[PDB]
């Protein structure tokens, strides 16, 4: 992709936001990977929308890309696990443990064991290391603080956290400039689909 084409994506991101095509905005952010929307990410973490959180992240990094990315996915999936335990859904917890968390076992065998053993407690706060889990809301906020620091320090997000400053409706402005150009060819002085003409 050209630098031109990349900039055009940013102009479109701005346009879509101004037109309040909100889901389209975040899909384009994700598929192009040119811009990671922190506020959007924070929103989804607070709402516990873990599926969308990972889907969004997937446009920017894989779990094993580097150590920051690994800890990011580990923290998210671990919170997902603990929340399952908290609602007494041990069936879901084990599912999460095997499908989402097992990839981390290689990197730290004994931590995975420690986390596995939480399954068998009446309340996993009986483990002193997990006695710090307060409620869902507070534990998400605490974790989010850590997630932000990991993302901001993650080299794969290096130039993707600040939106280019531009004047409002920059795309619309360029379009109007093209219309003026189309007219600056016409003697004797419609649509965007085909050029404007005069006799």
**12 or 142: whose CB is closer to a copy of itself?**
12
Contact 10, 164 (CB under 8 A): yes
Nearest approach, Cβ of residue 186 and Zn ion (Å): 3
What's CA 100's distance to the chain center, in Å? 18
Q: Which residue is nearest to Zn ion (CB)?
A: 186
Breaks in the chain (C–N beyond 2.5 Å) sit after 189
Residue 157 contact among a copy of itself, Zn ion, none, beta carbon within 5 to 8 Å by kind: none
* Sole residue written with tokens 């990349």: 6
**163 or 181: whose CB is closer to Zn ion?**
181
| C-alpha separations of 150 from 34, 57, 65, 69, 146 in Å | 18, 13, 13, 8, 6
Residue 40 contact among a copy of itself, Zn ion, none, beta carbon within 5 to 8 Å by kind: none
| C-alpha separations of 97 from 77, 83, 119, 135 in Å | 8, 12, 10, 20
Among 153, 174, 186, 198, binds a copy of itself (CB under 8 A): 174
Residue 185 contact among Zn ion, a copy of itself, none, beta carbon within 5 to 8 Å by kind: none
Where does the chain show beta strands of DSSP type E?
none
**129 or 178: whose CB is closer to a copy of itself?**
178
x/- contact string, 167-196, with Zn ion (CB under 5 A)? ----------------x--x--x-------
Nearest approach, Cβ of residue 170 and a copy of itself (Å): 7
Among 62, 113, 132, 149, binds a copy of itself (CB under 8 A): 113
Q: Cα(61)–Cα(54) distance, rounded to whole angstroms?
A: 10
Asked if 191 interacts with a copy of itself (CB under 8 A), we say yes
66 SS3 class? coil
Contact 50, 66 (CB under 8 A): no
Nearest approach, Cβ of residue 60 and a copy of itself (Å): 15
Nearest approach, Cβ of residue 149 and a copy of itself (Å): 29
Which residues contact Zn ion (rule: CB under 5 A)?
A: 183, 186, 189, 198
């Amino acid at each position: 992709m050209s630098s031109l084409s990349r900039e055009l994506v940013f102009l479109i991101l701005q346009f879509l936001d101004e037109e309040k095509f909100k889901e389209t905005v975040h899909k384009l952010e994700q598929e192009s990977g040119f811009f990671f929307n922190m506020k959007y990410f924070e929103e989804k973490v607070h709402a516990g929308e873990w599926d969308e959180v990972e889907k969004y992240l997937s446009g920017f990094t894989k779990v094993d890309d580097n150590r920051y990315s690994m800890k990011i996915f580990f923290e998210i999936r671990k919170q997902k696990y603990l929340e399952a335990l908290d609602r007494h859904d041990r069936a879901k917890a084990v599912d999460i443990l095997v499908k989402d968390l097992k990839v981390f076992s290689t990197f730290n065998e004994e931590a995975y064991k420690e986390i596995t053993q939480l399954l068998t407690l009446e309340n996993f706060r009986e483990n002193e290391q997990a006695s710090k889990y307060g409620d869902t809301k507070s534990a998400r906020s605490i974790m989010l603080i850590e997630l932000k620091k990991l993302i901001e320090a993650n080299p794969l997000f290096r130039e993707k956290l600040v939106f280019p400053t531009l004047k409002a409706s920059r795309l619309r402005t360029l379009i109007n400039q093209s219309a003026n150009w189309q007219h600056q060819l016409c003697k004797n002085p419609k649509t965007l689909f085909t050029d404007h003409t005069c006799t």
